[PDB]
Amino acid sequence: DRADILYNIRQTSRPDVIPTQRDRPVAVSVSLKFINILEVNEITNEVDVVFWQQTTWSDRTLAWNSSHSPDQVSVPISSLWVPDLAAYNAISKPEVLTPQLARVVSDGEVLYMPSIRQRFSCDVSGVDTESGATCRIKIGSWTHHSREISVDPTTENSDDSEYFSQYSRFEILDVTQKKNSVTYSCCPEAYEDVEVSLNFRKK
Amino acid sequence: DDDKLDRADILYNIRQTSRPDVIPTQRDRPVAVSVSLKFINILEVNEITNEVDVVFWQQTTWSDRTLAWNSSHSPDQVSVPISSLWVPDLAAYNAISKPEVLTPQLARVVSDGEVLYMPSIRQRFSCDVSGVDTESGATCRIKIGSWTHHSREISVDPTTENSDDSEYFSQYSRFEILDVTQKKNSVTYSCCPEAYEDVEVSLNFRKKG
Amino acid sequence: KLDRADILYNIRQTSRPDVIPTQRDRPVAVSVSLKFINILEVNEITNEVDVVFWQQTTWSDRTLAWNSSHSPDQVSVPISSLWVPDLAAYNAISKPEVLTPQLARVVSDGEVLYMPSIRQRFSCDVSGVDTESGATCRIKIGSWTHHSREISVDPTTENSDDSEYFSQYSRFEILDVTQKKNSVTYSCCPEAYEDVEVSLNFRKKG
Amino acid sequence: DYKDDDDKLDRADILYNIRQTSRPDVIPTQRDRPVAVSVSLKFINILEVNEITNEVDVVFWQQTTWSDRTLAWNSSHSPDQVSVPISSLWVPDLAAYNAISKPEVLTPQLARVVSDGEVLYMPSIRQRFSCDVSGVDTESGATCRIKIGSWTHHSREISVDPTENSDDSEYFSQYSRFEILDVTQKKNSVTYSCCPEAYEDVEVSLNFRKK
Amino acid sequence: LDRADILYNIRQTSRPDVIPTQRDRPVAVSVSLKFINILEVNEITNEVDVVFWQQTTWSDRTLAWNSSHSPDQVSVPISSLWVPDLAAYNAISKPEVLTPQLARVVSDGEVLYMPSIRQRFSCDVSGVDTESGATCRIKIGSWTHHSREISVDPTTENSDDSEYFSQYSRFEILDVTQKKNSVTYSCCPEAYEDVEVSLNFRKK
Numbered sequence A: 001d002r003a004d005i006l007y008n009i010r011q012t013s014r015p016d017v018i019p020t021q022r023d024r025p026v027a028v029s030v031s032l033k034f035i036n037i038l039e040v041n042e043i044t045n046e047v048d049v050v051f052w053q054q055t056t057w058s059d060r061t062l063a064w065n066s067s068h069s070p071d072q073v074s075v076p077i078s079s080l081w082v083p084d085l086a087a088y089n090a091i092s093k094p095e096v097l098t099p100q101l102a103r104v105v106s107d108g109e110v111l112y113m114p115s116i117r118q119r120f121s122c123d124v125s126g127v128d129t130e131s132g133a134t135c136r137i138k139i140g141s142w143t144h145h146s147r148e149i150s151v152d153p154t155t156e157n158s159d160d161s162e163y164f165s166q167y168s169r170f171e172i173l174d175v176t177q178k179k180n181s182v183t184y185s186c187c188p189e190a191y192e193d194v195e196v197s198l199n200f201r202k203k
Numbered sequence B: 001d002d003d004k005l006d007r008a009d010i011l012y013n014i015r016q017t018s019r020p021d022v023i024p025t026q027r028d029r030p031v032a033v034s035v036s037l038k039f040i041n042i043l044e045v046n047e048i049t050n051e052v053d054v055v056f057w058q059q060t061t062w063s064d065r066t067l068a069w070n071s072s073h074s075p076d077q078v079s080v081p082i083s084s085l086w087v088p089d090l091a092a093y094n095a096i097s098k099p100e101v102l103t104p105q106l107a108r109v110v111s112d113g114e115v116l117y118m119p120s121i122r123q124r125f126s127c128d129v130s131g132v133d134t135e136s137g138a139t140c141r142i143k144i145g146s147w148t149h150h151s152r153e154i155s156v157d158p159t160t161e162n163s164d165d166s167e168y169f170s171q172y173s174r175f176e177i178l179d180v181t182q183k184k185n186s187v188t189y190s191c192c193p194e195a196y197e198d199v200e201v202s203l204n205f206r207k208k209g
Numbered sequence C: 001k002l003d004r005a006d007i008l009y010n011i012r013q014t015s016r017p018d019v020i021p022t023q024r025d026r027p028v029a030v031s032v033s034l035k036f037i038n039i040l041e042v043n044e045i046t047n048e049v050d051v052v053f054w055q056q057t058t059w060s061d062r063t064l065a066w067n068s069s070h071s072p073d074q075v076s077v078p079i080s081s082l083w084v085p086d087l088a089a090y091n092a093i094s095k096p097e098v099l100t101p102q103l104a105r106v107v108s109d110g111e112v113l114y115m116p117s118i119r120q121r122f123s124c125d126v127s128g129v130d131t132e133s134g135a136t137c138r139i140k141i142g143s144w145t146h147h148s149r150e151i152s153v154d155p156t157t158e159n160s161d162d163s164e165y166f167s168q169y170s171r172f173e174i175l176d177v178t179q180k181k182n183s184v185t186y187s188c189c190p191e192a193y194e195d196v197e198v199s200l201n202f203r204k205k206g
Numbered sequence D: 001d002y003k004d005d006d007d008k009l010d011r012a013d014i015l016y017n018i019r020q021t022s023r024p025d026v027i028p029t030q031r032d033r034p035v036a037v038s039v040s041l042k043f044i045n046i047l048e049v050n051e052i053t054n055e056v057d058v059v060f061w062q063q064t065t066w067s068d069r070t071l072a073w074n075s076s077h078s079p080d081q082v083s084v085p086i087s088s089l090w091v092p093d094l095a096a097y098n099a100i101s102k103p104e105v106l107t108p109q110l111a112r113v114v115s116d117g118e119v120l121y122m123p124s125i126r127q128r129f130s131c132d133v134s135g136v137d138t139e140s141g142a143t144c145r146i147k148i149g150s151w152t153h154h155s156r157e158i159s160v161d162p163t164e165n166s167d168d169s170e171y172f173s174q175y176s177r178f179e180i181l182d183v184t185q186k187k188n189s190v191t192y193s194c195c196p197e198a199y200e201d202v203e204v205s206l207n208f209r210k211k
Numbered sequence E: 001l002d003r004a005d006i007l008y009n010i011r012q013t014s015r016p017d018v019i020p021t022q023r024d025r026p027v028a029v030s031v032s033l034k035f036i037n038i039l040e041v042n043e044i045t046n047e048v049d050v051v052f053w054q055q056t057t058w059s060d061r062t063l064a065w066n067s068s069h070s071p072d073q074v075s076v077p078i079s080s081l082w083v084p085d086l087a088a089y090n091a092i093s094k095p096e097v098l099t100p101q102l103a104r105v106v107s108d109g110e111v112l113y114m115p116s117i118r119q120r121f122s123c124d125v126s127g128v129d130t131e132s133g134a135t136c137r138i139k140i141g142s143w144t145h146h147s148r149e150i151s152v153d154p155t156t157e158n159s160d161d162s163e164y165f166s167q168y169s170r171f172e173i174l175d176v177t178q179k180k181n182s183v184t185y186s187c188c189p190e191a192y193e194d195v196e197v198s199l200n201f202r203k204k
C-alpha cells in the first residue's frame, strides 16, 4: 500500500514546477522554531542559530483516497517540489541536520520540517541587557514573486519555551513572525517574506 | 558463506525486493528499531556553552522479513550498501552539527531478514556539561528517534539500558565514563501532535584526575 | 500549471547546458553586477577580505523564447537545465559558496536571469580601511575559459554606494562601488578575456 | 608484455572486460576462502600532535592489495596493468577503529588492476586518531597505535595481513616537526559484545618523537 | 549548431577512463604552475598554503576535427574527457579547485586544462624572512601511471611569475624553477615522472 502511494506520487510529482491551482499563488506556510543560539558576536553583529523550519504547502494533484489506506507517507524531498526559500540576511549556507524527508498527506498537503543550523547578520546590540537583543531574519522565495508564491507565518507570537534548549547560555524573550514584502531595483517584482524577530538575552 | 555466486545472488534478491524509500511495515504494525549507542570518545567539552563533541557506534537493527532467504546451503549474511536498503530516518533532537559518518556505509542483512547497521559517528550536541570537572561528573542527555515517523510507524527499543561502556570507550580519552543509561521516551510538540518514540541516552562522565 | 510544465519541457528540449548560446558568430553578451550585502572579515596584514554579494547575472538565449500571449511570462528553472556562463573571480582565494537556491528565471523573450547570493574570500588591497578615505578592494570577474570572441561581459550599474543592499549591521560601510569593463591576457593564455572590474571602496565604521 | 602496454585499444578492451566481470558490492571470495587483503601504511607526515587530548593528525599512503582472479587476462601480447576508477571495483571496507575524523583522500581514486587479477590501491590519506601521545617529547618517544580492518566482514570473509618493520625513511617528510623512530605493523583480532564474530585487523604501531 | 556538433563528436570518441596513448608512446603531459598567492607560511611546522593556476596540456588526436569552417576550440566539461591523474607528492590537504571544471579542446586534438587550485604543502620554509628567502619544493606527477604510460614536461623552467602573482601578498616571489624529475619508491617498482617546482620566495 505504501509503495503504491509512493509510486503514485512519483508518477504525478513535478519537482521543478510550482504546484499552482487555477493560476493562483502557492500558499507556503512557514514558522521557525528556535532550538538553540550557539554563538553571538556583539562586535560583528552575527549570530549562529539552530531552528526547525516548519514548512507546509499543498499540491492537490498528489492527493489520494485514504478511506482504506495510509493517509500519510514519508517521501524524499528529491521526489517533490519544495519552495525555494532563502534568508535575505544569511551569511552561511543552511546546514540541514536532519533526514531530508517530507510527509505527504492524502489530501495533498506536504509537510517539511528540517532542523537547520545557519549564521545571520543582524542586530545583536543589547544582548547582555534585560530587554535583550532583537535579531531579525527575513525568509522568502528567492526567485518566485508574490503572484507565484505567497509566504504566510503560522504562529505570529511565541516565547518558544516548548522548543528552545534549556542548556543554551541565552534565553528567548519573544519571537514574532510577521508577513513582510521586499522589492529591490535589481528585481522589479514584489517578493513576500516572513520577518522573524528573535528577541533574546544572555542568561 | 564464501560461495561467491551465492552472495551475488543474495544481493540481487535483496535489491529486487528492497524498497529503500518505503518502511517495511506489515499489516499496519510499527517497524521495531533497536538502538544502542556505544561511546568511543569524548573529544571536546565546553562547560560555558554546554556543548560536547563525541564519537559513538550507533548499533541499529530492525527486520524486513521480505528480505529473508533459506540459508541451509548458502551464506547466512551479506554486507549491503545502505543505499540499497530502507534505513530508519533517525536523528538526535539536540544535535548541533551534522552526523559525520566515519565508517563504510554498509549494513549486514541476515538470512532471517534482520538488518544490522552500525556506523561510527562523530557529532556535536547541546546538553548539560555542568559538573564535568567534579567527582560526580556531568550528565549529558541525547534523544534519538525517527524524524518523520510517529509511534504507529516506528518504535524505538533500547537494547542495553545500563552500562559503563568500559568495553568500548577509549582509554586515551581526557575523560572517563561513569555511567550510560539508555531508556525509552517519547516526544510530542505543538507543531507535530503525533507521539514520536526515541531512545534517551544519558551520558554521565567526568574529566580524569 | 501544465502550461508551466510545458514551458520547462520546451526549455529542456532546446537547452544545451554545455554549449554557449552564440547567435550569428557573435559573443554571448553577459551582464554582471555585484550587489554587496556584507563584509564579514577584513585583514590588513594579509590583505584578505570575506564578503557576501548578490551576483546579478543576465544573458539571452533566443532559442528558449516562447509566445507568452496566453501563458506565463517567466518560470524558474534549475541551472543544471541551462547553459550558464563559467564566471570566476581572478583574485578569489576560496571557492564561491552559493547561499541561495540554484534556480534561474527564464523570460519568454529568451532572457535568462541568475542571481546567487555568494560568500567568498579575495586577495585585494585592504590598506586604508581604518581611515576616512577607506580601502579600495578590486575584484575581477569574467569567463574562465571563453575569450572575448565567445563571451563579452558588461557591467550594468557602473557607480553606486550600494545603500539599497548593504547590511546596516556590518561593522563596515560602503563609500562607493564602481564596476567597469576590463580585459586581460597572459602568456599562458594568448586570447583577450573580458571581465568586470569591481572596485569596492569601504571603511570601518566609527 | 612491455611492448603492448601503450596499445590504447587493448587498454580500453581490458577496462571493458573488468567492468563486465567486476561485482563492486560482492566480496571476491575464491574456493570458499576469505579474501586475503594486505595493508601497509607508509607515513608521510605527522601534522599535529596533542599530548593533552592524546590526538594525532597524520598523512599516510595506505598500500592495499588483494586479488580477484576473475579479472585476470592473458597479457602475452597486451598491457600488463591498467588504472581503474575504484567505483568500478570491489574494494575492502577498511576502517580505523580509533579514527576520530573521516579519512580525507588526497589523491585520485584510481586503482591498478594487474593481468593476474591482483588489485593495487594506494590512496594518500589525511586522518586524525585517538592514541597514546605520551612521551612524544622524550628520546624513547611516543607510540601511537592505529587499528585498521574490515568494518563489516568477519575473519571468515576477509583476512588482513601486514605487508612489518621500517623507519619509513623513504617516505617520511624530512621537513616534519617530528621524526619516526619505528613503524611496526602486526596481525591482530578484535571482538566486541555487540558483534559476536572475530574481525581481523592490522595494528600499526607508530613510534615517533618531536625533533 | 557547429559547437553542439563538435561536443557530440568529442563525446562519441572520448574515452574518459583510458590514457590516450598514441603510437605506443607515453602520453606527453605538460605541466606548469603559475603562482597567484602565498596565503600562509609556518616556519615552525614547515607548511605553506598557496594558490596557483595549474596549466596542463596534452594531446588526443582522436578528438581532432577539420576547423576550416567551424570553431578552432570549444570548452568541454572535464567529466567528458580523460584528464591526467596528477597529484602533489607533498600535499597535506585536498586540492581545492576554485574555478569552473572545464577544459579547452583544440581542433588539432590538444586539450588545455588550467584550474586555479588552493592547496597546502609540506616543504622547507626556512629562510623565508631573509634576503635569499625560502625554497619550497613541490613535486607533481601522475599518481598511478608510471613513465612508460605518462611523461611530464615543464613549459617554463625559470620565471619570477610577475604576470600572475598577487601584488597584495605578504610575500614576494624571487624565482620559480620547474624541472623534469622521476621518483621511485620501494612500494612501486617503476619510475614515475614528475615536475619538480622550486618556489623561492620571501616575506616582504
Ligand SMILES: C(#C[C@@H]1CCCN1)c1cccnc1
Residues within 6 Å of the ligand: A141, A142, A143, A184, A187, A191, C103, C104, C105, C113, C114, C115, C116
Ligand atoms: C529575485 C529576487 C528577489 C529579490 C532578491 C531575492 N529575491 C531574482 C530574480 C531573478 C533571478 N533570481 C532571483
Ligand SMILES: C(#C[C@@H]1CCCN1)c1cccnc1
Residues within 6 Å of the ligand: A101, A102, A103, A111, A112, A113, A114, B146, B147, B148, B189, B192, B196
Ligand atoms: C515531525 C516531528 C516530530 C518532532 C521532530 C521529530 N518528531 C515532522 C513532521 C512533518 C515533517 N517532518 C517532521
Ligand SMILES: C(#C[C@@H]1CCCN1)c1cccnc1
Residues within 6 Å of the ligand: C143, C144, C145, C186, C189, C193, E102, E103, E104, E112, E113, E114, E115
Ligand atoms: C584561460 C584563461 C584566462 C586567463 C585565466 C582565466 N581566463 C584558460 C585557457 C585554457 C583552459 N582554461 C583556461
Ligand SMILES: C(#C[C@@H]1CCCN1)c1cccnc1
Residues within 6 Å of the ligand: B106, B107, B108, B116, B117, B118, B119, D150, D151, D152, D191, D192, D195, D199
Ligand atoms: C561489525 C563489526 C566489527 C566489530 C566492530 C567494528 N567491526 C558490524 C556488524 C554489523 C553491522 N556493521 C558492523
Ligand SMILES: C(#C[C@@H]1CCCN1)c1cccnc1
Residues within 6 Å of the ligand: D110, D111, D112, D120, D121, D122, D123, E142, E143, E144, E185, E188, E192
Ligand atoms: C603508485 C605510485 C607512484 C608512487 C606513489 C605515487 N605514484 C601506485 C601504484 C598502485 C596504485 N596506486 C598508486
